[model samples]
Target chain A: ATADTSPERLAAIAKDALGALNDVILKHGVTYPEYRVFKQWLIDVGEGGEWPLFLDVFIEHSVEEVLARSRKGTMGSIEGPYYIENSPELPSKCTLPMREEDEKITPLVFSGQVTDLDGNGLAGAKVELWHADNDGYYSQFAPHLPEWNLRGTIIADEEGRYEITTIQPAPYQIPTDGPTGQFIEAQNGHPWRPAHLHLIVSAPGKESVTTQLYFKGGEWIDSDVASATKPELILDPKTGDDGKNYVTYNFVLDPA
Target chain B: ATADTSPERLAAIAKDALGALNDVILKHGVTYPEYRVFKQWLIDVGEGGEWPLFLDVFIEHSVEEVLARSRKGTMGSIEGPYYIENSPELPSKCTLPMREEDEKITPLVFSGQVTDLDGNGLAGAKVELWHADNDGYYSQFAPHLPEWNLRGTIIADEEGRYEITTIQPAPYQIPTDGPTGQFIEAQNGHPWRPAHLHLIVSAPGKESVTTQLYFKGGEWIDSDVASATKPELILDPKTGDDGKNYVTYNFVLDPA
Candidate 1:
């Protein structure tokens, strides 16, 4: 959808945006060679179709921050660039679709309830969850996995509670073969993001919260290349007597 | 060529550069829709192969401004993106190659001398000149124009003097069918640059000056979309008895 920003507002924003870049150029005394290199890099990024990935990593956090000001429930993070729509729907208590090979990894039993700010359970709530596998690759993105592997749309029970069983995800690097990778490598910065689960939790008559839940002690949690971590979003799971990892978190929704 | 910026330096610049953009987003309260539009526009600009053109118009002037601080001669301007190297060489006194249709426009006689800071003429100096035709299209950039039309490397005489004949170009809008055009049009900004001649004058052991010479009282001179015009770079040409426009401007070079 096109932005409805007025022409005058657009002019103001464009002026400041261009001015900000000009300030950086002047402040750094950027040489023509450096300018040329940046120019080429911009071109290469678009040609490589990495603008979405790059922005989601380095820019989307600020946009999410702006949105958070008016939000009144669970904190939100960047939805990232990999989200796909309409995965298979399942019951409140169910296992996410996965490959046979994925069954070998330690299973995680994650339970969550969807409630309003007043702590009232909301019916007809849905939690769309997707995560990578032990190999640090998503299903459709890696091509070898099943179409909906490790992805699902879970319908919470009438009490707004659900328990999902899925394999623990491993931390993964952003695609490092493109210009975005070059940008980080050129600056000697790590490209890794912390292992996490992406979810868009929603309930009828409430706003949806697109967020990520990270492990408390996950690798790269402090240095997510995407700068997408938040303290309140961390989850600490415990090993159960049944040899499964168990975690419980609740989603709070704001009125629409 | 890859920029040789150290990793630390790159890290520093990248931080501030990204910080600047993030600040703009915050300051403007840029909405997700606006962000999405901007993301798409960036991709379109690169895919349309307009990054060089867009950057040269909007950003190169700042780089030139930085370079100007270290120089003590004629002011420098952007080389623009249309320059092509190795145009056919010509004598000091000669007319540029042009088609019969181009010859229908008013002829212009441009004479210039290249000298050092002390006003002493320099030997082996060259005036590489190129500009749009009456239709505001450069030779190599426009498919219909001859390869070297109105483009030449003039070999100055022993006194570093050269008189070249060319056409009086008309101001033109940048290509408006691409993403760059959409950017301008979206903001209700015009896209016209003033009529001007591009020149790079140099001699051995001297720092070459890349500049544009604009006509006095020309259309768009006061409000060039590129923001490239300067008071010192404007020239006034007089109409001679032969019905040809004549002007003489000298170039001052700095020691390398």
Candidate 2:
């Protein structure tokens, strides 16, 4: 079923929720006094700054769903909120950093191959990636960070296979205090996104998949504020021939 | 038709809205950078600071639907975000302010009454009134305003009717600099709410109605951001004795 997510639909559905809220307020006779109390509380708790958690609460974002809704291919997930641009294109294979600010991250050599629907290798496939540091910050948002620090694009080899060495991007917290954040905090929860690797894999004549490689059992994997994750997207990393952490996944593309 | 407006429904429906947003992003190939652009815009705009127009854009917050989901009463809309406790109770006939500033608003003599569903007068019924000034700000929210100004409560007479004097409230714009304001601005529209009068009418052993009286032909009446008006709620005022504007409406309640 092809459906559109448009603003017209937004108003009606949102109205359903507003009507629900009114029911509770009416049931409890919550009037002006309660309104005043809440307003004052928001002011005391800081009402005039960046809430920093808008998407966390407003979006049920995950690459898992992205795949289901994307051009049919191997499973995919959402390309989250911190992807970096200007990542240099690497030829064949490349090494990755495992530390920042004295924190040693999980170093891994991730290998993947691209193929057509007929299982034919697509040489020189494009695979772009970006991830967060061990402390859960990305180069773009993290202060004093150099450009393209943990982000890059690589081309698959003649065999249509690619190997990338990088750290298991650390789980990060979505720091905030507004209504969006308060919803999670009231449940004794932290607004943390799971460790993930953003990848866009494709060939010139094939459909591309923009997705995230999720870390199994990572922080907030189940309770991610975005509520995005899938068992299939989780990776199991191990040491490989180079004696570094090694990971692997498959990307099967459809004809354009 | 058996749908209940509950908190559970709220979460699921809100999920619908979120999923809808994602569908668009996935379709348009909108990634993290544009996401970042909007996030920073919200930050600079303090998009969280009580964008009074939030409900306007997102809700069907009118009396007809609110009463269906909320308590079963004559008819009610939102109790609104400003109400003052300690409003002195009155009996039968009462007097309301005709103006606040140097502006001599259309002096009004508003009359109303309360009764049971069976048409019996609720003698000494409690009738409360709250309204905004010509500038569209409530007494409580307006800076340098006294407590309980333009908010009061009165009782219905032995005939189950009441009368009060005041000014015909004017439509007001909800000013903003954040996403909320930008939404209407981009449409070249005014973020104006129609002129209205808020009232609560109830009597012993009968349910009450908390609703707003809209002025016909007021600003944003048909296009109210809250989508909160109906022909039933709109009133056509006329000139009355003492050279004052006159309006009238009735409230019939259900068994408590």
Candidate 3:
């Protein structure tokens, strides 16, 4: 005898199969409690700027399952405070800025070229610069300073040579309002930054290096937040004739 | 008294003032050891999934500075392992694959509604479903199973209804390749997951919830690696006289 096939019969079959699958899954379950411990450690450690460490470990451990088993995307990190914009711009042949009313100090001139990893000159590259005013505060961060007073952007010449005129940078403090700040204060540690000029060197199709130029003889030259202090990034101040100051430096980048 | 507006004169003024500022900063440089310790803490804690706790402390302390600092944009917590994606083109009904010789287990019929927080039916909501096969292995993760065998997507109709017919799920083990797995093994923790269906419910302008429905009486009901086990998310099996099984479920979402 032939059997009848109807919509009701099909729906019945589907429901039965789904129920069976649910039964099997409920039979073998797993539990996870480590997530709680990890949460507690986060608060106990407080904020000491080591937040990135947790991200690295989490990614290193969970990348595979998170990417394969789960329907979500992979992980990434975010930028922190201490980032700055609007640096100084200078011309190749200009005299360094110095005022007679200002206290007499040795003058220095800074000059440099932007190049790629292959030692090729990057012409027309934009070099932006910024440093703390005499009191150790960038213009906007300092109440008494003018907008972009000490900040400027300069483009490199055909030969990749660029120049700018500015005062030496003073060390400054990182903001201490977060857990990182609390932890530092509790440890009786100071938050002053080293004397340095921030630089953002960019060119086409190459990796851009955002870094700082430190005074070689500065006390905290080796110390910096973001772990960005590099020995080779330091510069030496030079005395100038005709009562003017000058210094020169070079920057390089890798191909993208 | 009038000052000379000559280039040489201005150069001297800039040089001395800049140098003085540099000196001020160098004298009060930020301490490096403290910064490093803090940075390390952030990274270690984040990997442990103490995200909410970490955020609590970070926001409380940084709130003031974050409000005062206008030069840069604020950032939320760094990225994590999972994120939600919306798919609204899936089918509203699916049929279980059956063979003439397969008589040991009955077929299953499943249906559910996708609704928003206000109980408004959400049309075109995509529901992703995944679970272990009858032999206790997930389709994609298991070596002997076919790709997409037990995985499928269903979209909600205008009435917010979705239906699916699939085999019952069995409990399975989480992958032990990474740190989470290693930690579990070291602690003598069981990695087996309870029989359940992984579901990612999504629609535009609504918060998507990636969750699972557990069987009412499962060994691992209290043990879930993902740290997700709410009593309300469990389901009870249904039996019938026609040798067919059927199950019903409803899902509610929070507003986006």
lDDT of 3 by residue, A1-256 (tens): 1223343443343234333322322322101122233234355444444354322221211222222232211111111233446444566444333334223433445787887755678876777665665666666666766666566676678877887766666676665665445434444555565777766676777555555677778876655533445566677776666564566777776655
DockQ of each: 0.81, 0.15, 0.04
Q: Using lDDT as the measure, what is the rank order of every candidate, best first? A: 1, 2, 3
Query: lDDT tens digits, residues B1-256, model 1?
Result: 5777998999999999888888888888998898899889888998899999999989998899889888999999999999889988999899999999988999999998999999999899999999999878889888999899989999999999999999998897899999999999999999999999999999999999999999999999999999899999999999999899999999999999
lDDT of each: 0.92, 0.64, 0.52
Model 2: per-residue Cα lDDT at residue A118: 74
Candidate ranking under DockQ, highest first, comes to: 1, 2, 3
Best by DockQ: 1
Candidate that scores best on lDDT: 1
lDDT of each residue in B1-256, candidate 3, tens digit only: 1222344433343234333332322332312232343244345444554455323222221222222232121111111122223322347887533233223556566788888756778886777776656666655455665555556667778877998877666665655554334434444556665667767777777665556677788778777544344576677768678666678887776756
Model 2 alpha-carbon miss at residue B76, Å: 1.7
Q: In angstroms, give how far residue A149 of model 1 lies from its true place.
A: 1.0
**How large is the i-RMS for each model, in angstroms?**
0.9, 10.0, 30.8
**Model 1 pairs whose backbones collide:** none
Q: What TM-score fits each model?
A: 0.98, 0.66, 0.39
